[PDB]
Design a protein around this ligand. Structure first.
Ligand SMILES: NC(=O)[C@]12CN(C(=O)Cc3ccccc3Cl)C[C@H](C1)C2
Ligand SMILES: [Zn+2]
Length: 139
């Protein structure tokens, strides 16, 4: 679990979104595993606007933060799950690091702010759904 709160927006993994999120839906993309909903309260997370390939992510299955080198956002095949059939997830960044299903929603940050959230993993790898291209989150 986990979310990004910037201005009047809440960014979550689309597979973990609540009824409130869908009843206050701004944007959603199943190929990205992202859902953005409107909030009443003002959010303060700064989103990074960069091409960083190093950062730190929160791993709730270890209750620790981890420094990672990660790939550039791309189309990466994701094995069929209960939430989605077998498909290529877009805007996904991989890194060598620990992850477990309850880890989805873990924030990845660089020096410029929020890069993205944990969305995939397994076999000693962790995937992050990128949010730096979503320029409308600040306007
Ligand atoms: N992005 C997806 O299609 C999902 C991918 N998901 C996993 O990769 C689950 C997972 C397995 C082992 C280690 C880590 C993780 Cl996160 C779970 C949910 C469907 C999100
Ligand atoms: Zn950066």
């Amino acid at each position: 679990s986990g979310a990004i709160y910037v201005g009047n927006y809440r960014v979550v993994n689309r597979h973990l979104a609540t009824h409130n999120d869908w009843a206050n839906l701004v944007w959603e993309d199943s190929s990205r595993d992202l859902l953005v909903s409107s909030t009443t309260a003002q959010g303060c997370d700064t989103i990074a606007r960069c091409d960083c390939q190093t950062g730190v992510y929160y791993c709730s299955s270890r209750r620790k933060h981890y420094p990672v080198s990660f790939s550039k956002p791309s189309l990466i095949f994701v094995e069929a799950s209960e939430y989605y059939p077998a498909r290529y997830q877009s805007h996904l960044m991989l890194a060598v690091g620990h992850s477990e299903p309850g880890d989805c929603g873990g924030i990845l940050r660089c020096q410029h702010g929020v890069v993205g959230i944990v969305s995939t993993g397994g076999n000693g790898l962790v995937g992050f759904a990128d949010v730096r291209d979503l320029l409308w989150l600040d306007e």
